[PDB]
PDB file of C-alpha atoms in Angstrom:
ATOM      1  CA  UNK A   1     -18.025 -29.050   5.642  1.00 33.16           C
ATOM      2  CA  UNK A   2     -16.971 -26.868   3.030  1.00 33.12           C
ATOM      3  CA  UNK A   3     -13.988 -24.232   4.074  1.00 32.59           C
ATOM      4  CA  UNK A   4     -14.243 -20.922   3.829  1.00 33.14           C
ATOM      5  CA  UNK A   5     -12.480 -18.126   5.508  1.00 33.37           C
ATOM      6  CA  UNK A   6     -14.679 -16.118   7.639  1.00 36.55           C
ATOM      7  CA  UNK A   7     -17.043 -18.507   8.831  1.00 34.16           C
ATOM      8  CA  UNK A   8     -17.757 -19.781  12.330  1.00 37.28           C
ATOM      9  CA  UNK A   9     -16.508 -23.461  14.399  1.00 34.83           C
ATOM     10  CA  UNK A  10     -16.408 -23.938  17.758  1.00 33.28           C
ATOM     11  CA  UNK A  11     -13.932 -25.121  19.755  1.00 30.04           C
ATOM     12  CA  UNK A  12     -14.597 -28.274  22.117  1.00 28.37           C
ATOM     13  CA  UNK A  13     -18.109 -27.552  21.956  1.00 27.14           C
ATOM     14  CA  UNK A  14     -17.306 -23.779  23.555  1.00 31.95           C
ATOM     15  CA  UNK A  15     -16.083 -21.009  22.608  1.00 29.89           C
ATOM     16  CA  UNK A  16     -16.488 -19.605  19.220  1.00 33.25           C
ATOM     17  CA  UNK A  17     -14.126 -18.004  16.336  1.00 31.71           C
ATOM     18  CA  UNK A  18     -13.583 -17.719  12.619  1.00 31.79           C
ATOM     19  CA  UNK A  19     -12.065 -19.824  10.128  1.00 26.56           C
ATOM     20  CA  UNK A  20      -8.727 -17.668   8.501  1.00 23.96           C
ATOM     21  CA  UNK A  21      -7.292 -19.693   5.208  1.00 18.59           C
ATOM     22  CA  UNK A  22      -7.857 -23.286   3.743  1.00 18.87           C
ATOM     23  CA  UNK A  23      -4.730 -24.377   3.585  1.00 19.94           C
ATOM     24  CA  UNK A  24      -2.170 -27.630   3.166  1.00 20.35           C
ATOM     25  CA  UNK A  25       0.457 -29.646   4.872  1.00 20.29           C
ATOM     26  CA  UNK A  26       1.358 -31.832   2.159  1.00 22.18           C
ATOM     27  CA  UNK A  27      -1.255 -34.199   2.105  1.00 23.42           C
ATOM     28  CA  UNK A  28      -2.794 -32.810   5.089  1.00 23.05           C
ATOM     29  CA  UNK A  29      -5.955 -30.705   4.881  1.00 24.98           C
ATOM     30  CA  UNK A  30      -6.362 -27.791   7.252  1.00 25.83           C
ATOM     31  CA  UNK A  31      -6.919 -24.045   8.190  1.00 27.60           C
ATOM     32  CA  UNK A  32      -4.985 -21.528   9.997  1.00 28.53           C
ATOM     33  CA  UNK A  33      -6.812 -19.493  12.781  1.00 25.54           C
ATOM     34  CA  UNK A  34      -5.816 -17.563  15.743  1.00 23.74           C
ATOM     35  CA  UNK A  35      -4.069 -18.785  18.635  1.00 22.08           C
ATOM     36  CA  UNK A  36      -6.186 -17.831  21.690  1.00 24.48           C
ATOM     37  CA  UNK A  37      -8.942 -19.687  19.850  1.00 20.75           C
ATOM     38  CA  UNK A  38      -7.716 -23.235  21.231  1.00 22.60           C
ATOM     39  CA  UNK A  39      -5.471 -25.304  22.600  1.00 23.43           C
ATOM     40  CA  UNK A  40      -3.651 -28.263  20.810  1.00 24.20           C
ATOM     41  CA  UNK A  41      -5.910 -31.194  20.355  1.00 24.91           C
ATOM     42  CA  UNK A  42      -8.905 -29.239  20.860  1.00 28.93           C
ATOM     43  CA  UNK A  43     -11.571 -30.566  18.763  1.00 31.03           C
ATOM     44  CA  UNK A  44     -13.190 -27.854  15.919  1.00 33.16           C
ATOM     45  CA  UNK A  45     -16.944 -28.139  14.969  1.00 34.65           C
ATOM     46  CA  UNK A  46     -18.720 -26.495  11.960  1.00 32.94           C
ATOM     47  CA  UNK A  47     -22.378 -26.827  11.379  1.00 33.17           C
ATOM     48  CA  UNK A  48     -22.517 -29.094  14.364  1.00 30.77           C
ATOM     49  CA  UNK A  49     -20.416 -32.025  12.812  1.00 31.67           C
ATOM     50  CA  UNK A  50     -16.613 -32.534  14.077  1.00 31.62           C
ATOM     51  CA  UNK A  51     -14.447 -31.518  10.991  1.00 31.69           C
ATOM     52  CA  UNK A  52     -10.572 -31.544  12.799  1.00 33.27           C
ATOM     53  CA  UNK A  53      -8.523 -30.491  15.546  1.00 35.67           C
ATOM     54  CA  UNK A  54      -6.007 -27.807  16.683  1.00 37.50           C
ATOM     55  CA  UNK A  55      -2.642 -29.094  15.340  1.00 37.62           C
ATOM     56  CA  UNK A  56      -0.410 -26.494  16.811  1.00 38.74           C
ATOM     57  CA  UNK A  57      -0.306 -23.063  18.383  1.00 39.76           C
ATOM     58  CA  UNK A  58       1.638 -19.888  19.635  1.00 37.86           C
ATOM     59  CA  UNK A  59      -0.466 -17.927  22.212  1.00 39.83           C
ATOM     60  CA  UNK A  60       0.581 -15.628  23.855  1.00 39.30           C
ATOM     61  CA  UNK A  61       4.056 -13.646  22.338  1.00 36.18           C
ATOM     62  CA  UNK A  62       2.537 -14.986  18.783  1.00 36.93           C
ATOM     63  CA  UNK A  63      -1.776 -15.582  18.305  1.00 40.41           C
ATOM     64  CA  UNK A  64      -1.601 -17.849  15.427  1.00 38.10           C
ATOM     65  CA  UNK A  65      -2.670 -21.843  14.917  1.00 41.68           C
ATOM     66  CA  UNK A  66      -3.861 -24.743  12.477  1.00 41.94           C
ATOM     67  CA  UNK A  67      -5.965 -26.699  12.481  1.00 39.96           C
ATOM     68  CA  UNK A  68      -5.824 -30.488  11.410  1.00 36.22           C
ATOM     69  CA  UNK A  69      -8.930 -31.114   9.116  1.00 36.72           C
ATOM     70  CA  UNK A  70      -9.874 -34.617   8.420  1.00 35.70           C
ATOM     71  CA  UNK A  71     -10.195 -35.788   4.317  1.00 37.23           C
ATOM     72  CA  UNK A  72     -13.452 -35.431   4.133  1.00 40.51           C
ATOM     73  CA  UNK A  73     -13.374 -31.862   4.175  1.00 45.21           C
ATOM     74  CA  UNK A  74     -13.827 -29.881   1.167  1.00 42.38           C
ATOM     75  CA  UNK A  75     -11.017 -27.081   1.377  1.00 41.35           C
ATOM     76  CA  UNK A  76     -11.721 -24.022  -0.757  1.00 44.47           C
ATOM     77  CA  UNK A  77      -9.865 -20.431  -2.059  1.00 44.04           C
ATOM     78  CA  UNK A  78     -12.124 -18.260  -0.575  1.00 43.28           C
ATOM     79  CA  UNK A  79     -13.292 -15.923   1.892  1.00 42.46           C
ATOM     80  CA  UNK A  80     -16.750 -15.226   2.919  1.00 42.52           C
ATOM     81  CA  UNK A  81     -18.463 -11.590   1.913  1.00 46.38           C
ATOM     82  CA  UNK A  82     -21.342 -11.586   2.727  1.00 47.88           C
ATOM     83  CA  UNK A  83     -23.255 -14.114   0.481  1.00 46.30           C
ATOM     84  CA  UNK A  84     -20.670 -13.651  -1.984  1.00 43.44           C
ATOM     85  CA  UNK A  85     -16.908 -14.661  -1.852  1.00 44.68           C
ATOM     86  CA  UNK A  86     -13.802 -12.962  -2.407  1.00 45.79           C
ATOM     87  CA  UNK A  87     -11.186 -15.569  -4.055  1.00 42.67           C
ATOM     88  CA  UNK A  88      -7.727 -16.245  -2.001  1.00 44.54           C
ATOM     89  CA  UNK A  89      -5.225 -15.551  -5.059  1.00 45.66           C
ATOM     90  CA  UNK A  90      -1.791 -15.373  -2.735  1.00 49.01           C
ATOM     91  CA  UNK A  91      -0.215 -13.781   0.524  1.00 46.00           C
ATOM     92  CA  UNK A  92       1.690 -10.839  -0.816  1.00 46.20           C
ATOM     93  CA  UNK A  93       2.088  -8.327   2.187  1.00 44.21           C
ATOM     94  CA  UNK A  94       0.075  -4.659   1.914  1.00 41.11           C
ATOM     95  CA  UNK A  95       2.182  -1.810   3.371  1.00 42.14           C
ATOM     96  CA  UNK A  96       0.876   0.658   5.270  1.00 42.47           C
ATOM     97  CA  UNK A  97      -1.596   3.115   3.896  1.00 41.80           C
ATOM     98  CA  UNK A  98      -3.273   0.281   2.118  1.00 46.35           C
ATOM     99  CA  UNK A  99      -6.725  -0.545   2.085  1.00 48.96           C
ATOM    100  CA  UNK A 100      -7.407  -4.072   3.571  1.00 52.72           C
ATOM    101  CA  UNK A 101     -11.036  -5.927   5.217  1.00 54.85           C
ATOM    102  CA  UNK A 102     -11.639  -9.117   7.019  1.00 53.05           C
ATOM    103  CA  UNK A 103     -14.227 -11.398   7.085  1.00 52.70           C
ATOM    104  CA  UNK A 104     -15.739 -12.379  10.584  1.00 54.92           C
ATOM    105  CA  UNK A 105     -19.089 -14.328  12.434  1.00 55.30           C
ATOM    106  CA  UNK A 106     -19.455 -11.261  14.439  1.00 53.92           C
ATOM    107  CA  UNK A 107     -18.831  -7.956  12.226  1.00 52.30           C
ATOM    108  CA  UNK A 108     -19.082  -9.909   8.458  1.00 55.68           C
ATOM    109  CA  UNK A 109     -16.904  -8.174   5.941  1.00 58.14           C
ATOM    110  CA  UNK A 110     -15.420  -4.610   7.086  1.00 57.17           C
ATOM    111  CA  UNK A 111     -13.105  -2.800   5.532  1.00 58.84           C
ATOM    112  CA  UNK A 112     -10.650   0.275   6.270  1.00 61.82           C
ATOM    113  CA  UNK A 113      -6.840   0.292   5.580  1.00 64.43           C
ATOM    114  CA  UNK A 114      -3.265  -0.757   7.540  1.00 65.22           C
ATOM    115  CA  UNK A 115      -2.408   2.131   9.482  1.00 65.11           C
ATOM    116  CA  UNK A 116       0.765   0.605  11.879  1.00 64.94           C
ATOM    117  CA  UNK A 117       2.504  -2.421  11.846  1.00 64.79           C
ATOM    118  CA  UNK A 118       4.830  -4.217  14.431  1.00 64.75           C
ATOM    119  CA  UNK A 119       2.230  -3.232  17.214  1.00 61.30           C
ATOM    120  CA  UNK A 120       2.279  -5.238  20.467  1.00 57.98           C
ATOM    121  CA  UNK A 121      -1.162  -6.141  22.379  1.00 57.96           C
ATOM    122  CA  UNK A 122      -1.300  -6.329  26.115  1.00 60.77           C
ATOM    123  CA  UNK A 123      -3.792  -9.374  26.728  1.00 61.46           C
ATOM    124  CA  UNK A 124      -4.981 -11.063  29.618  1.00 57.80           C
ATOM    125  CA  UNK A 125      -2.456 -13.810  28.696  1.00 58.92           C
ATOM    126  CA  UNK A 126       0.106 -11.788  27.910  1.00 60.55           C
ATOM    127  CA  UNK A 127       1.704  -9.718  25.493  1.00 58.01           C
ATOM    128  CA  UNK A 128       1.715 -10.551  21.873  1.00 58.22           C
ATOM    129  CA  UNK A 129       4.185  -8.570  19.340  1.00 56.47           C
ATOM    130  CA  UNK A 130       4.609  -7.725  16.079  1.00 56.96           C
ATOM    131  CA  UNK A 131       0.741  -7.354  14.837  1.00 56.90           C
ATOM    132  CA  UNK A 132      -0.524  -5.259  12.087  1.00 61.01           C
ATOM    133  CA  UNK A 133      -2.879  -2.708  13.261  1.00 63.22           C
ATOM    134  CA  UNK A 134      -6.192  -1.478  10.662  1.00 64.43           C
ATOM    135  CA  UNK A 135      -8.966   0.872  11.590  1.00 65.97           C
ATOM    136  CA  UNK A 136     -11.881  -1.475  10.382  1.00 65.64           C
ATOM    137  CA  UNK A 137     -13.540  -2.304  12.712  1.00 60.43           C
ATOM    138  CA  UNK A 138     -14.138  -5.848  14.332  1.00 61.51           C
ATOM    139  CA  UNK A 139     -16.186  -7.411  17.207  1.00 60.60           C
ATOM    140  CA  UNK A 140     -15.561 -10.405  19.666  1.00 61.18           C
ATOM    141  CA  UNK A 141     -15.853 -13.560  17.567  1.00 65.08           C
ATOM    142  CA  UNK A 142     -14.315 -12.512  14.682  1.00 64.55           C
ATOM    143  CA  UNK A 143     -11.193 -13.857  15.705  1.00 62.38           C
ATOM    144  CA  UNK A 144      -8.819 -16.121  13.822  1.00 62.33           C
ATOM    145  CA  UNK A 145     -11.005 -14.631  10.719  1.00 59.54           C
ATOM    146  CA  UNK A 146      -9.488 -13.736   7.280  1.00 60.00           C
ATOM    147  CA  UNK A 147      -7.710 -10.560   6.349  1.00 57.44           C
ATOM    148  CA  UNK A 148      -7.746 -10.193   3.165  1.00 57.82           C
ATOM    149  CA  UNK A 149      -7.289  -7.454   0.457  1.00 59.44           C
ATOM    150  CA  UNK A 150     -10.045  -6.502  -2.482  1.00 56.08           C
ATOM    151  CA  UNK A 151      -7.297  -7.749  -4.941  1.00 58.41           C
ATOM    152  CA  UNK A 152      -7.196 -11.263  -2.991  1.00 58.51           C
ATOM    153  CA  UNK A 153      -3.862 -10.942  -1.059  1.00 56.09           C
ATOM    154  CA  UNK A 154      -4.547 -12.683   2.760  1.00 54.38           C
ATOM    155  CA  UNK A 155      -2.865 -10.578   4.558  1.00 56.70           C
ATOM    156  CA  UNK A 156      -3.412 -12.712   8.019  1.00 53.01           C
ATOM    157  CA  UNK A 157      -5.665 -13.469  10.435  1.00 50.97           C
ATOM    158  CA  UNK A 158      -7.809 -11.834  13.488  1.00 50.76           C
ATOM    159  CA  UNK A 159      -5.944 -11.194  16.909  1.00 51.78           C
ATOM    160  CA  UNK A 160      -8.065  -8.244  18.553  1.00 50.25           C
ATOM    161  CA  UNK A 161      -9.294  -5.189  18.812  1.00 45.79           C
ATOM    162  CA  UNK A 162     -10.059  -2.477  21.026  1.00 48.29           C
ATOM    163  CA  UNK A 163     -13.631  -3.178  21.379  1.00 48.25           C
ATOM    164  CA  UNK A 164     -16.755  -1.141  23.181  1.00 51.03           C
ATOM    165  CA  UNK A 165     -18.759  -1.955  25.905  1.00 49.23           C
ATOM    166  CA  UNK A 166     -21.192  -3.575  22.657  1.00 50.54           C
ATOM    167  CA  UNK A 167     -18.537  -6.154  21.744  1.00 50.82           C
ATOM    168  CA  UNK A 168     -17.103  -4.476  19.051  1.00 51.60           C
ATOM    169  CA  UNK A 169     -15.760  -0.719  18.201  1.00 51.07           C
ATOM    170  CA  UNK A 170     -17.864  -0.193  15.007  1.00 54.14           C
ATOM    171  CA  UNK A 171     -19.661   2.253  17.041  1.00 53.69           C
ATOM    172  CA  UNK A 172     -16.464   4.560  17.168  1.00 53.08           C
ATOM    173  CA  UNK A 173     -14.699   6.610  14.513  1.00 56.06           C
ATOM    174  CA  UNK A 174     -11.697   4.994  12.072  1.00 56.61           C
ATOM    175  CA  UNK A 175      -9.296   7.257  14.162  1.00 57.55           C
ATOM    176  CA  UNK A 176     -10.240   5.341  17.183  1.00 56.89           C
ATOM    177  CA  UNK A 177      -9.912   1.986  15.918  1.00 56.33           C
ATOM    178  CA  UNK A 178      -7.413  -0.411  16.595  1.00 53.83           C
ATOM    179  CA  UNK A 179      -7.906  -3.620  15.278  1.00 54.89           C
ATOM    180  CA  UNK A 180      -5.269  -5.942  15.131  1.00 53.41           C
ATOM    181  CA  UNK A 181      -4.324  -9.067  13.043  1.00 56.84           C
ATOM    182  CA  UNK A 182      -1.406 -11.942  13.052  1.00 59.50           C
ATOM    183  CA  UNK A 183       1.087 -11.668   9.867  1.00 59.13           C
ATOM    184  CA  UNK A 184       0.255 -14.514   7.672  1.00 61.21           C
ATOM    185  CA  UNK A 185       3.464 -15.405   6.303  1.00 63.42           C
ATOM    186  CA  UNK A 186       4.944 -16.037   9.670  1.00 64.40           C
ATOM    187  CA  UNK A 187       1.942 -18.765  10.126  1.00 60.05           C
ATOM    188  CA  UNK A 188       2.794 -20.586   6.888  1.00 58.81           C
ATOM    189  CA  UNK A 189       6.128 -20.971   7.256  1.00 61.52           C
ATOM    190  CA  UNK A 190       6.229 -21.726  11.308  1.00 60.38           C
ATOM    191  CA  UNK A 191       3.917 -24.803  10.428  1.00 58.52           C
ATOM    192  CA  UNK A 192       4.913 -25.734   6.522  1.00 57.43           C
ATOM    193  CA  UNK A 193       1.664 -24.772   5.435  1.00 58.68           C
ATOM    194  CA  UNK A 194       0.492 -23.837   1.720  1.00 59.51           C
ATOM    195  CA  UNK A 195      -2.241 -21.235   0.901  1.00 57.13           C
ATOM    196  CA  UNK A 196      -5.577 -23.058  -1.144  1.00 59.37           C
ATOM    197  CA  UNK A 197      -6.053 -20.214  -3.722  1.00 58.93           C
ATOM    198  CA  UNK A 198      -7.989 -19.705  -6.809  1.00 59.09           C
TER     199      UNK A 198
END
């Protein structure tokens, strides 16, 4: 399968999330995602066929994971808008006030800016600290998906979100949103990964 931040696997033939980055682990092949999307040696499928398996994860206190893809899987610098693509080009950190979307099976490609950082989530599971906070909105499925800016900076990837009684809180203003993502840097360097850009 060909990798592409945004799009949708399932985990052990279950639940469902979205991919965050193509990345590398030396001569590994793989993709970071959230956390709460599996458990480690949980098998990922994408278009039906078995492409890898969660290598590692920090869920709750962190919501970030990788997983393990197997060679024949083609990895790829970008993120899914839409039909088009928006190319991975590094991980430089936005500050707040900046404009930011993310690309998700659920909500697709939504946009709005960083308004908070360091923001802790109260979860089922448990707490989880230190996530950046945006008022795009995002629905239940677009976790683990790509955050990304317009100028191709990821940024991270989907943790949660305040969502509606619909799934999602697209159906309330920006000033009521909080939708919250993992830092990406922490990811990368926690497992030794490198970013696939373009």
């Amino acid at each position: 399968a060909n990798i592409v931040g945004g799009i949708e696997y399932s985990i052990n033939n279950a639940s469902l999330c979205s991919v965050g980055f193509s990345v590398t682990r030396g001569a590994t092949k793989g993709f970071v995602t959230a956390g709460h999307c599996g458990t480690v040696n949980a098998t990922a499928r994408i278009g039906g066929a078995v492409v890898g398996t969660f290598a590692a994860r920090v869920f709750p206190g962190n919501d970030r994971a990788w997983v393990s893809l197997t060679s024949a899987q083609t990895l790829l610098p970008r993120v899914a808008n839409g039909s088009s693509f928006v190319t991975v080009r590094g991980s430089t950190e936005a500050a707040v006030g900046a404009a930011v979307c993310h690309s998700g099976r659920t909500t697709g490609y939504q946009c709005g800016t960083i308004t908070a950082k360091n923001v802790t989530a109260n979860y089922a599971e448990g707490a989880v600290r230190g996530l950046t906070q945006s008022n795009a909105c995002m629905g239940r499925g677009d976790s683990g998906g790509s955050w990304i800016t317009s100028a191709g900076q990821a940024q991270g990837v989907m943790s949660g979100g305040n969502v509606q009684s619909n799934g999602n809180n697209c159906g309330i203003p920006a000033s009521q949103r909080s939708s919250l993502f993992e830092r990406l840097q922490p990811i990368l360097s926690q497992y030794g990964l490198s970013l696939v850009t373009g």
